[PDB]
Amino acid sequence: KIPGYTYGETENRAPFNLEDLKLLKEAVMFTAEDEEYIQKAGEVLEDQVEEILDTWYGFVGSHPHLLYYFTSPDGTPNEKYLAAVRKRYSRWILDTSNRSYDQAWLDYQYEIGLRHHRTKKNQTDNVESVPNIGYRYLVAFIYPITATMKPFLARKGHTPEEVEKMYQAWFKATTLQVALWSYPYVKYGDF
Amino acid sequence: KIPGYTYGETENRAPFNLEDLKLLKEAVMFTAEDEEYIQKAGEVLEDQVEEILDTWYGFVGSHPHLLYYFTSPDGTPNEKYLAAVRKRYSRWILDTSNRSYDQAWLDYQYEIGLRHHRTKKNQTDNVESVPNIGYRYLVAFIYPITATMKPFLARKGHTPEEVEKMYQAWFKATTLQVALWSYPYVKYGDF
Ligand code: HEM
Ligand code: HEM
Ligand SMILES: [C-]#N
Ligand SMILES: [C-]#N
């Protein structure tokens, strides 16, 4: 249903395993409590995805140096690229909320990292665009991901403490993912 | 003074400049509005630093794979190392809140990244310890840094809205810094 989306059918095994993941979850203070609240976050976000996507890509589109990563050689946004990625980002919202964080999840996290990185960027959609997303901005984007989700998490009449727990779970899960996605960017042996 | 603390006295110019910083601030949604609240955060945190340090190093100390980065080759924690770093971390709380984010600030950011990385780790305190802090944990630590600061930000009686603004400012500034500290870890040209 979703072009380019290959969760559970990636070509590579991730260079990290469930033991690595356990230790990283501990570093981001992610526990069974957050598994519960990330699932609840999904329930709240699921029917708000179109507005989330508009808010997220609105932010990206608001800064030329960010929109840059979706541009054709002529400096204009590649609309085919944007539209195809948007469908996979929509799915990532659900995957973050609903998937077991097992080896298949890890294998896809590695894949997503490879796709932001020069290793695989522009291959999934067969587009001509910029070769690499500078790592500085991947880390940076942990923040706007959280700031984007925050208002939507409060829109279904949950208690502010329930919202805070969903927001913190999202923050933890996003940090965890970007940590994993960093692998292809990091000098070998330094990850 | 503070042994090893060389803010404004670094040997190298950072590989990033104020134009890089402007673009990265935009990526973390940091504006003039956050400058106000990061300064306020400093006013709130300053006389609570001992408790903050105890909480932070309490978290690190409670996980063998994190405390690991302060250990001597025989696996035992190096208490001299811990104590010396603690003094510099205490200063970093104030610098984040009080310094102009100019080229001197950027130069020290580069230096802090080099000190977590194998490039300079263990040199400042002339200790023998683990050669490198795996980058996965630098990213991960954005979360617990923010989680550690949050309760302290509310202890001076500011409104929930002001506390939230201080917290969000701290989150942005932490993410911004970790993005810069990634430089020595990232494959050359991919940052
Ligand atoms: C917290 C940080 C980020 C998150 C959570 C995120 C999320 C995602 C997701 C879910 C996908 C689709 C993955 C798939 O193929 O299944 C994707 C791809 C993509 N993202 Fe991001 N992203 C982040 C950082 C960034 C940044 C900084 C940029 C720069 C504008 C960016 C631009 C893109 C582009 C251009 C693609 C397509 C890559 C390709 O050619 O395959 N992303 N992102
Ligand atoms: C958001 C992430 C982090 C922040 C804000 C932070 C903060 C700091 C600060 C302010 C310093 C002193 C810098 C100076 O010399 O002036 C430092 C050094 C140090 N930190 Fe971190 N840190 C982070 C990640 C980590 C992680 C994941 C570890 C692993 C336990 C760690 C362990 C250490 C060690 C061992 C040093 C001494 C390095 C050296 O030999 O010079 N830090 N950190
Ligand atoms: C990424 N969007
Ligand atoms: C780092 N402490």
Residue numbers in the entry:
A (entry chain B), B (entry chain A): 5 to 195
Which sentences from the paper describe this structure?
The cyanide derivative of the ferric Phe(93)E11Tyr and Phe(145)G8Trp MaPgb* mutants (Phe(93)E11Tyr(III)-cyanide and Phe(145)G8Trp(III)-cyanide, respectively) was crystallized by vapor diffusion techniques (protein concentration ~2.6 mM) under conditions matching those for the ligand-free ferric protein. Similar considerations apply to the conserved dimeric assembly; this assembly is based on the following: a four-helix bundle built by the G- and H-helices, the H’-helix, partly the Z-helix, and the BC and FG hinges. Both ferric MaPgb* mutants have been crystallized in the presence of cyanide, which is clearly visible in the electron density of the Phe(93)E11Tyr mutant as the heme-Fe(III)-coordinated ligand but not for the Phe(145)G8Trp mutant, where the heme-Fe(III) atom appears to be free of a distal ligand. In Phe(93)E11Tyr(III)-cyanide, the ligand is bound to the heme-Fe(III) atom with a coordination bond of 2.41 Å and a Fe-C-N angle of 144.7° (2.50 Å and 134.0° in the second dimer subunit). The coordination bond length for cyanide is slightly longer than expected, likely due to partial photoreduction of the heme-Fe(III). Two hydrogen bonds stabilize the heme-Fe(III)-bound cyanide, its N atom being linked to the Tyr(61)B10 OH (2.63 Å and 2.57 Å in the two subunits), and to the Trp(60)B9 N Ɛ2 atom (2.92 and 3.11 Å in the two subunits). The distal site structure and the cyanide-binding mode observed for the Phe(93)E11Tyr(III)-cyanide complex is closely reminiscent of the ligand-binding mode reported for MaPgb*(III)-cyanide. The Tyr(93)E11 side chain of the mutated residue matches the position of the MaPgb*(III)-cyanide Phe(93)E11 residue, with only a small rotation (approximately 5–8°) away from the heme. Thus, in both MaPgb*(III)-cyanide and Phe(93)E11Tyr(III)-cyanide, the aromatic side chain at topological position E11 rotates approximately 90° relative to the position in MaPgb*(III) to provide room for cyanide to bind to Trp(60)B9. As a result of the new Trp(60)B9 side chain location, tunnel 1 is closed in both MaPgb*(III)-cyanide and Phe(93)E11Tyr(III)-cyanide. The consequences of the Phe(93)E11Tyr mutation are quite small, likely because of the comparable sizes of the Phe and Tyr side chains.
Pgbs are single-domain archaeal heme proteins that are related to the N-terminal domain of globin-coupled sensors (GCSs). In addition to the typical 3-on-3 helical fold found in many globins, the heme group in MaPgb* is completely buried in the protein matrix by a 20-residue N-terminal loop followed by an extra Z-helix and some inter-helical loops with a previously characterized functional role. Thus, the heme is only accessible through two orthogonal tunnels located at the B/G and B/E interfaces (named tunnel 1 and tunnel 2, respectively). Although MaPgb* assembles into a homodimer in solution, this structure does not result in cooperative CO binding.
